[PDB]
Amino acid sequence: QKHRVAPPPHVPGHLIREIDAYDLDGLEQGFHEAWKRVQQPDTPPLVWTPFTGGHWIATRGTLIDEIYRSPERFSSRVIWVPREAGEAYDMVPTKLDPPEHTPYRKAIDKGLNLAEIRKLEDQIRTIAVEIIEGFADRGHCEFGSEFSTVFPVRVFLALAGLPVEDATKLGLLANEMTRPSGNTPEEQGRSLEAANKGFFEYVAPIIAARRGGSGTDLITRILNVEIDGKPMPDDRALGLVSLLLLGGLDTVVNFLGFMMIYLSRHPETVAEMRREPLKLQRGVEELFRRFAVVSDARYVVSDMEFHGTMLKEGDLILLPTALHGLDDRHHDDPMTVDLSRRDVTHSTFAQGPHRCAGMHLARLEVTVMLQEWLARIPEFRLKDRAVPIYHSGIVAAVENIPLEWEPQ
Ligand code: HEM
């Protein structure tokens, strides 16, 4: 049964579209394909859905980019749908607007800036090689369970100085953050609340132990950056360390699954990467354009007209980031990975003050992954008649990616 809310008075019938972000029409064909169904040639730039508590969806890249760049008009006070889940959400600094946001982002950047991430290349490579060597000679693997859910998790837990045995419990919490269970807005709100509490419970003892600590791990480093000349308060620290884990452990996992399904179906593209290693390196941003996974929201600060659409204070707008990178008004043949594409502009990492703090780490993990994969498994395909299984929500997911090759 589908839960609908009635449109508010300011939403005209001609803008209503029945779009379920948590179970997109056509999702069985793929997450990106399903979002692309929404972006028809004449669809309005903003449409309103009665599902998921009732909310707007931006359907074109220029709006998505603009909204993310405009915190004074589109606030992060709520960035999840349904609203109940967005009100429960307590992660830092994603829930903050400038100026409150900026010292927290500065603290994170001390740990995640490009120069710091470059130091991690070798550690990341060792992890990738170890995993790949486990199955390269075999001629097959289930890429989800045997690689994409393993590699970024081992990388991040090592970087954070946390035990790899905590991977399962943390992944379960992440799932309920980004794809909360339930079929009513209130149920999904409760699910997110419970997940967010689980993260806080996990991180609290770590924070208490690492304040003033001598560890060189990511958490100690960021935690101990002063905020306006004093130690970071507990409330903020809980949300901050939780967000590191949420971003660090989930997002790259699912990005890799989408990417690899595509590459397994496009051996010509793989061959280009193998023949031209600089094309691989320089082409990673094109992969980010093509395989967006986040669809999150902003809160309309004031009654306004935006792109010819009347918005009321408190309205939520979902920003399906795939609809920027894949917008045919921004990129010709958008579903094609073209490693030499000069304009790769996208909002896979969003825009504006919150533009992904982990983007350098994400890029490095993907680059190293492709390098070490192709070194050992240069050619590969998706098993005949295999059907990956897709999930939509605030972060997309995919499972069942059986790959096959002739061992080299
Ligand atoms: C494929 C990989 C990734 C994608 C697509 C991605 C995407 C995003 C997006 C869209 C945002 C903006 C959220 C918003 O404000 O609405 C964001 C923020 C953030 N991401 Fe990522 N992310 C990725 C990997 C990572 C990694 C590996 C980390 C490491 C912890 C990370 C940490 C963060 C943090 C801390 C923020 C909040 C920044 C702020 O509020 O100023 N992300 N990410």
The token pair that represents 242 in the structure block: 């939780």
**C-alpha distances in angstroms, 100 versus 93, 135, 227?**
8, 47, 10
* Gap from CA of 29 to ligand 1 centroid (Å): 26
Strands 316-320, 309-311: pairing is unpaired
The token pair that represents 261 in the structure block: 């399904």
Which residues have C-beta within 8 Å of that of residue 384, sequence separation ≥ 6? none
Give the sheet arrangement for strand 46-49, strand by strand: 46-49, 55-58, 316-320, 295-300, 74-75
Cα(105)–Cα(97) distance, integer angstroms: 11
99: preceding bond cis by omega (within 30 degrees): yes
Which residues have C-beta within 8 Å of that of residue 276, sequence separation ≥ 6? none
Give the alpha-carbon dihedral of 341, 348, 324, 104, to 10 degrees: -130
Radius of gyration of the chain (CA): 21
Domains and CATH numbers, the chain: 1-408 (1.10.630.10)
Cα(132)–Cα(39) distance, integer angstroms: 38
Q: Is the CB of 239 under 6 A from ligand 1?
A: no
* Gap from CA of 153 to ligand 1 centroid (Å): 15
Cα(75)–Cα(301) distance, integer angstroms: 6
Give the alpha-carbon dihedral of 18, 21, 24, 25, to 10 degrees: 10
Q: Annotated binding site, which residues?
A: 101, 105, 298, 354, 356
Q: Is the CB of 196 under 6 A from ligand 1?
A: no
Cα(368)–Cα(32) distance, integer angstroms: 24
* Gap from CA of 214 to ligand 1 centroid (Å): 26
Q: Which residue's alpha carbon is nearest to atom 11 within ligand 1? A: 356
Name the residue among 168, 130, 127 with its Cα closest to residue 361: 127
Strands 316-320, 55-58: pairing is parallel
Name the residue among 353, 335, 407 with its Cα closest to residue 376: 407
* Gap from CA of 343 to ligand 1 centroid (Å): 22
CB 200 within 8 A of CB 257: no
Cα(240)–Cα(91) distance, integer angstroms: 6
Q: Which residue's alpha carbon is nearest to atom 19 within ligand 1? A: 356
Strands 316-320, 381-382: pairing is unpaired
Half-sphere CA count of 239, side-chain side, radius 13 A = 17
* Gap from CA of 248 to ligand 1 centroid (Å): 8
Q: Is the CB of 92 under 6 A from ligand 1?
A: no
Cα(389)–Cα(28) distance, integer angstroms: 7
Q: Which phi and psi angles does 74 have, rounded to 5°? A: -135, 100
SS in 3 state form for the chain?
CCCCCCCCCCCCHHHECCCCCCCCCCHHHCHHHHHHHHCCCCCCCEEEECCCCCEEEECCHHHHHHHHCCCCCEECCCCCCCHHHHHHCCCCCCCCCCCCHHHHHHHHHHHHCHHHHHCCHHHHHHHHHHHHHCCCCCCEEEHHHHHHCCHHHHHHHHHCCCCHHHHHHHHHHHHHHHCCCCCCHHHHHHHHHHHHHHHHHHHHHHHHHHCCCCCCCHHHHHHCCCECCECCCHHHHHHHHHHHHHHHHHHHHHHHHHHHHHHHHCHHHHHHHHHCHHHHHHHHHHHHHHCCCEEEEEEECCCEEECCEEECCCCEEEEECHHHHCCCCCCCCCCCCCCCCCCCCCCCCCCHHHCCCCHHHHHHHHHHHHHHHHHHCCCCEECCCCCCEEECCCECEEECCEEECCCC
CB 340 within 8 A of CB 279: yes
Determined by X-ray
Chain centre to alpha carbon of residue 107:
21
Q: Is the CB of 320 under 6 A from ligand 1?
A: no
CB 219 within 8 A of CB 241: yes
Cα(123)–Cα(382) distance, integer angstroms: 29
